Design an enzyme around this catalytic site. Structure first.
Site, PDB file in Angstrom:
ATOM      1  CG  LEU A   1      -1.934  -1.109   1.392  1.00  0.00           C
ATOM      2  CD1 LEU A   1      -2.613  -1.019   2.751  1.00  0.00           C
ATOM      3  CD2 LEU A   1      -2.954  -1.146   0.241  1.00  0.00           C
ATOM      4  N   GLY A   2       1.996   1.174   0.722  1.00  0.00           N
ATOM      5  CA  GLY A   2       2.956   2.254   0.900  1.00  0.00           C
ATOM      6  C   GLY A   2       4.335   1.718   1.174  1.00  0.00           C
TER       7      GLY A   2
ATOM      8  N   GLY B   1       8.442   3.215   1.861  1.00  0.00           N
ATOM      9  CA  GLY B   1       9.382   4.293   2.132  1.00  0.00           C
ATOM     10  C   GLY B   1      10.794   3.764   2.282  1.00  0.00           C
ATOM     11  CG  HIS B   2      13.512   6.822   2.450  1.00  0.00           C
ATOM     12  ND1 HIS B   2      12.934   7.514   3.510  1.00  0.00           N
ATOM     13  CD2 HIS B   2      13.494   7.614   1.353  1.00  0.00           C
ATOM     14  CE1 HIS B   2      12.567   8.688   3.017  1.00  0.00           C
ATOM     15  NE2 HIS B   2      12.873   8.790   1.719  1.00  0.00           N
ATOM     16  CG  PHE B   3      14.188   4.944   6.998  1.00  0.00           C
ATOM     17  CD1 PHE B   3      15.543   4.641   6.930  1.00  0.00           C
ATOM     18  CD2 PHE B   3      13.784   6.236   6.669  1.00  0.00           C
ATOM     19  CE1 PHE B   3      16.476   5.615   6.559  1.00  0.00           C
ATOM     20  CE2 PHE B   3      14.719   7.208   6.295  1.00  0.00           C
ATOM     21  CZ  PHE B   3      16.055   6.889   6.243  1.00  0.00           C
ATOM     22  N   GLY B   4      10.727   1.775   5.937  1.00  0.00           N
ATOM     23  CA  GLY B   4       9.642   0.853   6.237  1.00  0.00           C
ATOM     24  C   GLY B   4       8.562   0.799   5.189  1.00  0.00           C
TER      25      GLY B   4
ATOM     26  CG  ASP C   1       3.886  13.677   8.079  1.00  0.00           C
ATOM     27  OD1 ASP C   1       3.709  14.416   7.088  1.00  0.00           O
ATOM     28  OD2 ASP C   1       4.576  12.634   8.030  1.00  0.00           O
TER      29      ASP C   1
HETATM   30  N1  LIG Z   1      -4.871   2.070   7.098  1.00  0.00           N
HETATM   31  C1  LIG Z   1      -4.525   2.162   5.786  1.00  0.00           C
HETATM   32  N2  LIG Z   1      -5.363   1.654   4.817  1.00  0.00           N
HETATM   33  C2  LIG Z   1      -4.944   1.783   3.522  1.00  0.00           C
HETATM   34  N3  LIG Z   1      -3.824   2.360   3.017  1.00  0.00           N
HETATM   35  C3  LIG Z   1      -3.016   2.844   4.014  1.00  0.00           C
HETATM   36  C4  LIG Z   1      -3.304   2.769   5.405  1.00  0.00           C
HETATM   37  N4  LIG Z   1      -2.270   3.344   6.165  1.00  0.00           N
HETATM   38  C5  LIG Z   1      -1.381   3.762   5.250  1.00  0.00           C
HETATM   39  N5  LIG Z   1      -1.785   3.493   3.917  1.00  0.00           N
HETATM   40  C6  LIG Z   1      -1.075   3.783   2.661  1.00  0.00           C
HETATM   41  O1  LIG Z   1       0.304   3.715   2.911  1.00  0.00           O
HETATM   42  C7  LIG Z   1       0.912   4.983   2.748  1.00  0.00           C
HETATM   43  C8  LIG Z   1       2.036   5.138   3.788  1.00  0.00           C
HETATM   44  O2  LIG Z   1       1.556   5.111   5.095  1.00  0.00           O
HETATM   45  P1  LIG Z   1       1.792   6.140   6.304  1.00  0.00           P
HETATM   46  O3  LIG Z   1       1.512   5.184   7.505  1.00  0.00           O
HETATM   47  O4  LIG Z   1       1.017   7.383   6.175  1.00  0.00           O
HETATM   48  O5  LIG Z   1       3.356   6.339   6.304  1.00  0.00           O
HETATM   49  P2  LIG Z   1       4.837   6.870   6.468  1.00  0.00           P
HETATM   50  O6  LIG Z   1       5.227   7.254   7.835  1.00  0.00           O
HETATM   51  O7  LIG Z   1       5.692   5.695   5.850  1.00  0.00           O
HETATM   52  O8  LIG Z   1       4.927   7.897   5.289  1.00  0.00           O
HETATM   53  C9  LIG Z   1      -0.219   6.038   2.819  1.00  0.00           C
HETATM   54  O9  LIG Z   1       0.181   7.137   2.071  1.00  0.00           O
HETATM   55  C10 LIG Z   1      -1.389   5.242   2.191  1.00  0.00           C
HETATM   56  O10 LIG Z   1      -1.214   5.339   0.815  1.00  0.00           O
HETATM   57 MG   LIG Z   2       2.559   8.893   5.490  1.00  0.00          MG
END
Ligand SMILES: Nc1ncnc2c1ncn2[C@@H]1O[C@H](COP(=O)(O)OP(=O)(O)O)[C@@H](O)[C@H]1O
Ligand SMILES: [Mg+2]
Length: 278
Positions: free
Chosen positions: A15-16, A18-21, A128
């Site tokens: 779904l998402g 990043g560089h660290f997770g 954020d």
């Molecule tokens: N509960 C969720 N349901 C669906 N998609 C999610 C959810 N939480 C996060 N995402 C997806 O994952 C991405 C990264 O998550 P987020 O927890 O906001 O992260 P970070 O601290 O890595 O940037 C979000 O931009 C969204 O696209």
């Molecule tokens: Mg985020």
């Protein structure tokens, strides 16, 4: 209910990342019949940072805050939360430009504001608040999602001082954040105004806060970005009114961007402001 066994979290897709997770879609299936509920699992590969994020989210319960489901232990830990299929507003808005109108945008603005007002009442500063962290449950419901940079403001104190080496969304930040590292509820109001702008520009990448501010500050070395940004804001320069955004919505955005934190509108005043427009 809150303790998830690692062997029953069946990965579907990402779904998402990043560089660290990363954030993944899983089915917690302890029966093996493929009838388990779909969840959003947040993991690493920072360790103490995720635990702080887990701690905060675990203690928040609101209609417009992403639902905490539980944890998954290894020293490593995984955050389990509700899966919001339409994902973030940063993903949703560019794919639904033709589908989403002003009434709908206002309905999300009120929803973001309610989740934030709930958060402030819990003495937390999000740190954020951006479209990428606003998750779409439905056509008419959004929820605030990432508590990674979130800090608790001490009792009777007006703000929290961020003392660390972590990365920050500087293009969503209030001047006090950039200059003194101070984070007031009013700092979150500032980021909301930047989020509202993203929401009204349908998260167009060319019109993103970073892209517009970088276009305003010109050529800069990375070490001089924040100082160049502080100075742009001191001159009175702000993100322009999105085309087709009515003045009544722009004035509410402008109320989020008053230089001094005490001169900014509240989340409650913002709710009342958008409601009068619906
Ligand atoms: N509960 C969720 N349901 C669906 N998609 C999610 C959810 N939480 C996060 N995402 C997806 O994952 C991405 C990264 O998550 P987020 O927890 O906001 O992260 P970070 O601290 O890595 O940037 C979000 O931009 C969204 O696209
Ligand atoms: Mg985020």
């Amino acid at each position: 209910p809150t303790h998830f066994e690692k062997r029953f979290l069946k990965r579907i897709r990402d779904l998402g990342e990043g560089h660290f997770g990363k954030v993944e879609l899983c089915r917690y299936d302890p029966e093996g019949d493929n009838t388990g509920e779909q969840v959003a699992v947040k993991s690493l590969k920072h360790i103490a940072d995720l635990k702080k994020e887990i701690e905060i989210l675990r203690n928040l319960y609101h209609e417009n805050i992403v639902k905490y489901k539980g944890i998954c232990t290894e020293n490593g830990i995984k955050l389990i939360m509700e899966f919001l299929p339409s994902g973030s507003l940063k993903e949703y808005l560019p794919k639904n430009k033709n589908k989403i109108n002003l009434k709908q945008q206002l309905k999300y603005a009120v929803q973001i504001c309610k989740g934030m007002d709930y958060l402030g009442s819990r003495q937390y500063v999000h740190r954020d608040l951006a479209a990428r962290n606003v998750l779409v449950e439905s056509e008419h419901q959004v929820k605030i999602g990432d508590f990674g940079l979130t800090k608790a403001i001490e009792t009777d104190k007006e703000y929290y001082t961020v003392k660390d080496d972590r990365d920050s969304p500087v293009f969503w930040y209030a001047p006090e954040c950039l200059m003194q590292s101070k984070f007031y509820i009013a700092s979150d109001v500032w980021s909301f105004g930047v989020t509202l702008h993203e929401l009204l520009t349908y998260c167009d990448s060319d019109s993103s806060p970073m892209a517009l501010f970088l276009k305003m500050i010109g050529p800069t070395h990375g070490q001089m970005t924040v100082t160049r940004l502080v100075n742009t804001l001191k001159e009175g320069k702000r993100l322009p009114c999105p085309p087709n955004c009515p003045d009544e919505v722009y004035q509410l955005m402008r109320k989020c961007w008053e230089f001094q934190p005490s001169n900014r509108t509240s989340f409650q005043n913002l709710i009342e402001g958008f409601e009068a427009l619906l």
